Amino acid sequence: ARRFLNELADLYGVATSYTDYKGAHIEVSDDTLVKILRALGVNLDTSNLPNDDAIQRQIALFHDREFTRPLPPSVVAVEGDELVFPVHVHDGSPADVHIELEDGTQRDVSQVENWTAPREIDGIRWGEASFKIPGDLPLGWHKLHLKSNERSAECGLIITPARLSTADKYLDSPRSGVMAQIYSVRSTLSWGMGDFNDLGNLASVVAQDGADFLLINPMHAAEPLPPTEDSPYLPTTRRFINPIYIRVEDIPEFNQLEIDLRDDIAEMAAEFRERNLTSDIIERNDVYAAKLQVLRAIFEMPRSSEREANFVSFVQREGQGLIDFATWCADRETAQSESVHGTEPDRDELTMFYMWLQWLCDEQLAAAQKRAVDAGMSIGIMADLAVGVHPGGADAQNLSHVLAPDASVGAPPDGYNQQGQDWSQPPWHPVRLAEEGYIPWRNLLRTVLRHSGGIRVDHVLGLFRLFVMPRMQSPATGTYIRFDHNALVGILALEAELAGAVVIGEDLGTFEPWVQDALAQRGIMGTSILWFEHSPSQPGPRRQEEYRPLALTTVTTHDLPPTAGYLEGEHIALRERLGVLNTDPAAELAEDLQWQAEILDVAASANALPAREYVGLERDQRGELAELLEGLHTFVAKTPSALTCVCLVDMVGEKRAQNQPGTTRDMYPNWCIPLCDSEGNSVLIESLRENELYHRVAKASKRD
C-alpha cells in the first residue's frame, strides 16, 4: 500500500513525485522510495521489498522517537524571533531549561502553554512542555541545556541575521570585479600553475583598474599526493585547502634550508617555470610531487618561537576536524607508498606534516587577501564553495556520521541531458546534520570565509533540497530530499555576516517563489549570465534595465567558452568536434547568430554599441573583437546589478573553454587550459597591463 510508503516518505522529507528539468511529471517508484529511506537509516527489509507492517512500524517508531527527544536536534532562529520549542521529559520529572551563549553568559527561557497529552513509550510515561527563547539573543552559536533529575541533554541554539549588511551596501554602491581560474594564471615565478602568491599578485593588479573583488575557483583540498583531481568541483573535503597552491619559496623557513638544496629546488622551479611561457596543458601531478618533496624538507626546519606560537595557535583554533583530516592524509600516503622492511612511517609525525600544510595554506591565503585589500579592493578575494565532496575521500570518512553515503547527488533529466546527471557526491543526512548542531556546515563555511570578502555558493538550491539517486543507479531513478533551509541558509548568512562578507548563490534554474524569497530577504545575491538571460517582458534578450539588482551579473562563466570564442561560434565548434553535439552544426550556428544578434541589438538600445541593426549581418560584419567586447562589457556595467564580473579570459582575448560540461577528461583537458591570448600565447600576470585589450575591457567595465 503506497499510502503507507507516502506517509513514511513525508516524515523523512523524501519527495514522492517531482517535475523534471524538462517539465515532465514523474511519480517516484516504490523502489526508489525504499532505497532512499534506507540510505537515510530507515530500517526496511533488505530485499528492498517491505511489508505494510514494517512500513507502519517505521511510521510509529518515527513518532515515538520524536516524542522521546529531550531537546530538538538543534534550534535555529532569526535574530528577534521568540521561537517556541518542545522539550520531552519523563512525566512528573523536572524540565529545567536554560541557555548558554557562545561567550559563556547564561540566559533564561520562558515556559509557554503546551496542550499535548503524555504518552507511554517502551514502559515510560513521557510528557511534553514548550519553552520560548528571548527575542534579544546575540548572533551566534549558543546552546540549550536541559536537566531532568539525573538525565541531561543539550542542543545547539543558533541565532542567525535577518539580512547580510553587504547586500544594501552594494545595492547602493554597485561595484565590479574580475573572475580568474587561478591555477591557470601564471607569473614568471609560478611552478607551471598559479599559486597563492599569484592570487594576491593578480588581485593587486586588477585592483589598479577598479576591480573590488577577485572571484576564483574552489580551492578545497583534493588528494594529499599525486595523482590528483583536476576538477576543483570534486574535492576531498570542502573545509580544508589544497596544498598544491603553496608557493614554497614564500615560506619563512624556506630560507633556512642549505644553499645546495635551494639550488636543487631552483633547478626544479626553473623547469616548471618554462611551462609558464607555453600554452601547453596544465599538469598538476608532477608539480605537486615536486612541491611535496620540498615541503618535506622545509618541515624539518626549526621555527622561531613566534612562528611556533602562531602554528600552535592555528592548530588550537581548528580543533579536532584538522587532526581528523590530517590523519586521513597520513593514512592515504602510507597506503599508497611502499615502505621498506623493518621500517614504519611515523603516523603522528605525518599527521603533523598535513596539519602544518594547512597552516601554510592559511597564512598564504591571509597574505593574498591582505594584498587585495591593501590594493584598494572593498571585498577582496571571493571564494567559490563546491556543492560536495568525493565519495571515497577525507570528508566522506570523517563526516560519515552526518552523510547519507548510499545516495548520490545529481540532477534530474534535461532536454540537454536525457539521462540526467550524477555528480557522485554523498549528500548531507538532513536529520543527523541537525543533531550535530550543524557544526560541520559551520566549520567548512568559517574556513572558506576566513580570508575572503565573499562566497559564491555553487548550486544554492541545495540549501533547500537535493536531487539524489541510490548510489550507482541512473539519475532517472532519483528523487528530491528536503533540508531545513532556515538552518542551512540561516547559517550561511550568519557565517558571512560574521566575516563581513558578500554571499552569491548560483541560481540558474527556476524554482518556487518562496525559495527565491528566502534567499533575497537574507541579502543573498543571485547570478545573471548575459548569454542565458531572457526578458521577463518581451520575447528575446533581457533589457539592461530588467537585470535584477540583487545579483552578480557577468557576460560569461568558467563553463562557457570565453567571449572571443563564443562570438565566433566556439561553443558549437567545440561540442561538435568532441561528438557531444548530436544536432546539425549549421542549424545551431544559425540559432547562435540570431540570438547574438538580438543581444547586440538590445545592447545598442542601451547605447553600449552603435545601432547597426545586427540581425541579418554576417558573423564577421558585426565589428572587431575589441569593439564587441567593449560593447558587452559596457552593457553589463550599466545594469543596476549590485555586482558585475569581468572574466579575466575576456580581458586577454582567450578563445579556449576551461571546461566543456558533459565531457570527461579523456575528451578535453577540462580544468587544465592555461591563460592565453587570441594567438594562443601565454599571458603572464606581469604582462596583463601591457596589453591594449586588457585596458579597453577594463575601461568598458568601469561603473562610476
JSON list of N, CA and C in Angstrom, two decimals, residues 396-434:
[
{"chain": "A", "resi": 396, "resn": "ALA", "atom": "N", "xyz": [34.22, 12.15, 3.45]},
{"chain": "A", "resi": 396, "resn": "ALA", "atom": "CA", "xyz": [33.29, 11.05, 3.32]},
{"chain": "A", "resi": 396, "resn": "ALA", "atom": "C", "xyz": [33.51, 10.05, 4.45]},
{"chain": "A", "resi": 397, "resn": "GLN", "atom": "N", "xyz": [34.77, 9.92, 4.86]},
{"chain": "A", "resi": 397, "resn": "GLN", "atom": "CA", "xyz": [35.10, 9.16, 6.06]},
{"chain": "A", "resi": 397, "resn": "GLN", "atom": "C", "xyz": [34.89, 9.92, 7.37]},
{"chain": "A", "resi": 398, "resn": "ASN", "atom": "N", "xyz": [35.53, 11.08, 7.51]},
{"chain": "A", "resi": 398, "resn": "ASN", "atom": "CA", "xyz": [35.41, 11.87, 8.74]},
{"chain": "A", "resi": 398, "resn": "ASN", "atom": "C", "xyz": [34.05, 12.45, 9.10]},
{"chain": "A", "resi": 399, "resn": "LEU", "atom": "N", "xyz": [33.20, 12.65, 8.10]},
{"chain": "A", "resi": 399, "resn": "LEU", "atom": "CA", "xyz": [31.89, 13.25, 8.30]},
{"chain": "A", "resi": 399, "resn": "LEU", "atom": "C", "xyz": [30.84, 12.22, 8.01]},
{"chain": "A", "resi": 400, "resn": "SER", "atom": "N", "xyz": [31.19, 10.92, 8.03]},
{"chain": "A", "resi": 400, "resn": "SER", "atom": "CA", "xyz": [30.25, 9.91, 7.61]},
{"chain": "A", "resi": 400, "resn": "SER", "atom": "C", "xyz": [28.98, 9.95, 8.46]},
{"chain": "A", "resi": 401, "resn": "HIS", "atom": "N", "xyz": [29.15, 10.20, 9.72]},
{"chain": "A", "resi": 401, "resn": "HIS", "atom": "CA", "xyz": [28.01, 10.26, 10.67]},
{"chain": "A", "resi": 401, "resn": "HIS", "atom": "C", "xyz": [26.97, 11.35, 10.36]},
{"chain": "A", "resi": 402, "resn": "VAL", "atom": "N", "xyz": [27.30, 12.32, 9.48]},
{"chain": "A", "resi": 402, "resn": "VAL", "atom": "CA", "xyz": [26.33, 13.29, 9.01]},
{"chain": "A", "resi": 402, "resn": "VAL", "atom": "C", "xyz": [26.05, 13.25, 7.49]},
{"chain": "A", "resi": 403, "resn": "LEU", "atom": "N", "xyz": [26.35, 12.15, 6.84]},
{"chain": "A", "resi": 403, "resn": "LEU", "atom": "CA", "xyz": [26.14, 11.98, 5.37]},
{"chain": "A", "resi": 403, "resn": "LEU", "atom": "C", "xyz": [25.23, 10.82, 5.14]},
{"chain": "A", "resi": 404, "resn": "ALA", "atom": "N", "xyz": [24.72, 10.67, 3.93]},
{"chain": "A", "resi": 404, "resn": "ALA", "atom": "CA", "xyz": [23.88, 9.51, 3.57]},
{"chain": "A", "resi": 404, "resn": "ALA", "atom": "C", "xyz": [24.60, 8.89, 2.37]},
{"chain": "A", "resi": 405, "resn": "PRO", "atom": "N", "xyz": [25.67, 8.16, 2.64]},
{"chain": "A", "resi": 405, "resn": "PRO", "atom": "CA", "xyz": [26.56, 7.77, 1.56]},
{"chain": "A", "resi": 405, "resn": "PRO", "atom": "C", "xyz": [25.95, 6.76, 0.53]},
{"chain": "A", "resi": 406, "resn": "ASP", "atom": "N", "xyz": [24.84, 6.11, 0.85]},
{"chain": "A", "resi": 406, "resn": "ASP", "atom": "CA", "xyz": [24.24, 5.21, -0.15]},
{"chain": "A", "resi": 406, "resn": "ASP", "atom": "C", "xyz": [23.39, 5.95, -1.20]},
{"chain": "A", "resi": 407, "resn": "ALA", "atom": "N", "xyz": [23.34, 7.27, -1.08]},
{"chain": "A", "resi": 407, "resn": "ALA", "atom": "CA", "xyz": [22.74, 8.07, -2.09]},
{"chain": "A", "resi": 407, "resn": "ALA", "atom": "C", "xyz": [23.82, 8.92, -2.72]},
{"chain": "A", "resi": 408, "resn": "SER", "atom": "N", "xyz": [23.52, 9.36, -3.94]},
{"chain": "A", "resi": 408, "resn": "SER", "atom": "CA", "xyz": [24.44, 10.16, -4.72]},
{"chain": "A", "resi": 408, "resn": "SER", "atom": "C", "xyz": [23.70, 11.38, -5.28]},
{"chain": "A", "resi": 409, "resn": "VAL", "atom": "N", "xyz": [24.29, 12.55, -5.14]},
{"chain": "A", "resi": 409, "resn": "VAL", "atom": "CA", "xyz": [23.74, 13.81, -5.62]},
{"chain": "A", "resi": 409, "resn": "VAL", "atom": "C", "xyz": [23.87, 14.01, -7.12]},
{"chain": "A", "resi": 410, "resn": "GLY", "atom": "N", "xyz": [22.89, 14.67, -7.70]},
{"chain": "A", "resi": 410, "resn": "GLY", "atom": "CA", "xyz": [22.79, 14.78, -9.13]},
{"chain": "A", "resi": 410, "resn": "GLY", "atom": "C", "xyz": [21.74, 15.77, -9.55]},
{"chain": "A", "resi": 411, "resn": "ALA", "atom": "N", "xyz": [21.26, 15.58, -10.76]},
{"chain": "A", "resi": 411, "resn": "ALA", "atom": "CA", "xyz": [20.23, 16.40, -11.36]},
{"chain": "A", "resi": 411, "resn": "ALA", "atom": "C", "xyz": [19.26, 15.53, -12.21]},
{"chain": "A", "resi": 412, "resn": "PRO", "atom": "N", "xyz": [17.97, 15.84, -12.22]},
{"chain": "A", "resi": 412, "resn": "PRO", "atom": "CA", "xyz": [17.05, 15.01, -12.99]},
{"chain": "A", "resi": 412, "resn": "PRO", "atom": "C", "xyz": [17.23, 15.27, -14.50]},
{"chain": "A", "resi": 413, "resn": "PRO", "atom": "N", "xyz": [16.62, 14.46, -15.35]},
{"chain": "A", "resi": 413, "resn": "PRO", "atom": "CA", "xyz": [16.81, 14.56, -16.79]},
{"chain": "A", "resi": 413, "resn": "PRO", "atom": "C", "xyz": [16.42, 15.91, -17.38]},
{"chain": "A", "resi": 414, "resn": "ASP", "atom": "N", "xyz": [17.10, 16.24, -18.47]},
{"chain": "A", "resi": 414, "resn": "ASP", "atom": "CA", "xyz": [17.12, 17.54, -19.11]},
{"chain": "A", "resi": 414, "resn": "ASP", "atom": "C", "xyz": [16.74, 17.31, -20.55]},
{"chain": "A", "resi": 415, "resn": "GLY", "atom": "N", "xyz": [16.37, 18.37, -21.25]},
{"chain": "A", "resi": 415, "resn": "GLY", "atom": "CA", "xyz": [16.36, 18.27, -22.69]},
{"chain": "A", "resi": 415, "resn": "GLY", "atom": "C", "xyz": [17.81, 18.04, -23.09]},
{"chain": "A", "resi": 416, "resn": "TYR", "atom": "N", "xyz": [18.68, 18.83, -22.46]},
{"chain": "A", "resi": 416, "resn": "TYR", "atom": "CA", "xyz": [20.13, 18.83, -22.67]},
{"chain": "A", "resi": 416, "resn": "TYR", "atom": "C", "xyz": [20.83, 17.54, -22.26]},
{"chain": "A", "resi": 417, "resn": "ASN", "atom": "N", "xyz": [20.40, 16.97, -21.14]},
{"chain": "A", "resi": 417, "resn": "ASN", "atom": "CA", "xyz": [20.85, 15.68, -20.66]},
{"chain": "A", "resi": 417, "resn": "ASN", "atom": "C", "xyz": [19.66, 14.79, -20.46]},
{"chain": "A", "resi": 418, "resn": "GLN", "atom": "N", "xyz": [19.49, 13.79, -21.30]},
{"chain": "A", "resi": 418, "resn": "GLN", "atom": "CA", "xyz": [18.31, 12.93, -21.17]},
{"chain": "A", "resi": 418, "resn": "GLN", "atom": "C", "xyz": [18.51, 11.82, -20.18]},
{"chain": "A", "resi": 419, "resn": "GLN", "atom": "N", "xyz": [19.73, 11.61, -19.69]},
{"chain": "A", "resi": 419, "resn": "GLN", "atom": "CA", "xyz": [19.94, 10.62, -18.62]},
{"chain": "A", "resi": 419, "resn": "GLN", "atom": "C", "xyz": [19.90, 11.30, -17.21]},
{"chain": "A", "resi": 420, "resn": "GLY", "atom": "N", "xyz": [19.79, 12.64, -17.19]},
{"chain": "A", "resi": 420, "resn": "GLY", "atom": "CA", "xyz": [20.08, 13.46, -16.02]},
{"chain": "A", "resi": 420, "resn": "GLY", "atom": "C", "xyz": [21.54, 13.39, -15.73]},
{"chain": "A", "resi": 421, "resn": "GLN", "atom": "N", "xyz": [21.94, 13.76, -14.51]},
{"chain": "A", "resi": 421, "resn": "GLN", "atom": "CA", "xyz": [23.34, 13.81, -14.14]},
{"chain": "A", "resi": 421, "resn": "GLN", "atom": "C", "xyz": [23.55, 13.19, -12.75]},
{"chain": "A", "resi": 422, "resn": "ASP", "atom": "N", "xyz": [24.68, 12.53, -12.60]},
{"chain": "A", "resi": 422, "resn": "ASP", "atom": "CA", "xyz": [25.12, 12.01, -11.32]},
{"chain": "A", "resi": 422, "resn": "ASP", "atom": "C", "xyz": [26.44, 12.66, -11.01]},
{"chain": "A", "resi": 423, "resn": "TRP", "atom": "N", "xyz": [26.51, 13.47, -9.95]},
{"chain": "A", "resi": 423, "resn": "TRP", "atom": "CA", "xyz": [27.73, 14.21, -9.60]},
{"chain": "A", "resi": 423, "resn": "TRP", "atom": "C", "xyz": [28.59, 13.43, -8.66]},
{"chain": "A", "resi": 424, "resn": "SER", "atom": "N", "xyz": [27.99, 12.37, -8.14]},
{"chain": "A", "resi": 424, "resn": "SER", "atom": "CA", "xyz": [28.64, 11.35, -7.33]},
{"chain": "A", "resi": 424, "resn": "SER", "atom": "C", "xyz": [28.82, 11.68, -5.85]},
{"chain": "A", "resi": 425, "resn": "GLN", "atom": "N", "xyz": [28.41, 12.86, -5.44]},
{"chain": "A", "resi": 425, "resn": "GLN", "atom": "CA", "xyz": [28.70, 13.28, -4.08]},
{"chain": "A", "resi": 425, "resn": "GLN", "atom": "C", "xyz": [27.76, 12.67, -3.05]},
{"chain": "A", "resi": 426, "resn": "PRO", "atom": "N", "xyz": [28.27, 12.34, -1.84]},
{"chain": "A", "resi": 426, "resn": "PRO", "atom": "CA", "xyz": [27.28, 11.91, -0.83]},
{"chain": "A", "resi": 426, "resn": "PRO", "atom": "C", "xyz": [26.56, 13.11, -0.23]},
{"chain": "A", "resi": 427, "resn": "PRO", "atom": "N", "xyz": [25.23, 13.04, -0.11]},
{"chain": "A", "resi": 427, "resn": "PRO", "atom": "CA", "xyz": [24.53, 14.21, 0.49]},
{"chain": "A", "resi": 427, "resn": "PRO", "atom": "C", "xyz": [24.68, 14.30, 1.99]},
{"chain": "A", "resi": 428, "resn": "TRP", "atom": "N", "xyz": [24.45, 15.47, 2.55]},
{"chain": "A", "resi": 428, "resn": "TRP", "atom": "CA", "xyz": [24.25, 15.57, 3.98]},
{"chain": "A", "resi": 428, "resn": "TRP", "atom": "C", "xyz": [23.04, 14.70, 4.34]},
{"chain": "A", "resi": 429, "resn": "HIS", "atom": "N", "xyz": [23.08, 14.04, 5.48]},
{"chain": "A", "resi": 429, "resn": "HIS", "atom": "CA", "xyz": [21.89, 13.48, 6.09]},
{"chain": "A", "resi": 429, "resn": "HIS", "atom": "C", "xyz": [21.10, 14.64, 6.76]},
{"chain": "A", "resi": 430, "resn": "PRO", "atom": "N", "xyz": [19.89, 14.93, 6.30]},
{"chain": "A", "resi": 430, "resn": "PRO", "atom": "CA", "xyz": [19.13, 16.08, 6.79]},
{"chain": "A", "resi": 430, "resn": "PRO", "atom": "C", "xyz": [18.85, 16.14, 8.27]},
{"chain": "A", "resi": 431, "resn": "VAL", "atom": "N", "xyz": [18.64, 15.00, 8.89]},
{"chain": "A", "resi": 431, "resn": "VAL", "atom": "CA", "xyz": [18.49, 14.93, 10.35]},
{"chain": "A", "resi": 431, "resn": "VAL", "atom": "C", "xyz": [19.77, 14.83, 11.15]},
{"chain": "A", "resi": 432, "resn": "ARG", "atom": "N", "xyz": [20.69, 13.96, 10.77]},
{"chain": "A", "resi": 432, "resn": "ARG", "atom": "CA", "xyz": [21.92, 13.80, 11.55]},
{"chain": "A", "resi": 432, "resn": "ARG", "atom": "C", "xyz": [22.73, 15.07, 11.56]},
{"chain": "A", "resi": 433, "resn": "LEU", "atom": "N", "xyz": [22.73, 15.81, 10.43]},
{"chain": "A", "resi": 433, "resn": "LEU", "atom": "CA", "xyz": [23.48, 17.08, 10.43]},
{"chain": "A", "resi": 433, "resn": "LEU", "atom": "C", "xyz": [22.89, 17.99, 11.48]},
{"chain": "A", "resi": 434, "resn": "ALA", "atom": "N", "xyz": [21.56, 18.03, 11.56]},
{"chain": "A", "resi": 434, "resn": "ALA", "atom": "CA", "xyz": [20.87, 18.88, 12.61]},
{"chain": "A", "resi": 434, "resn": "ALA", "atom": "C", "xyz": [21.10, 18.40, 14.06]}
]
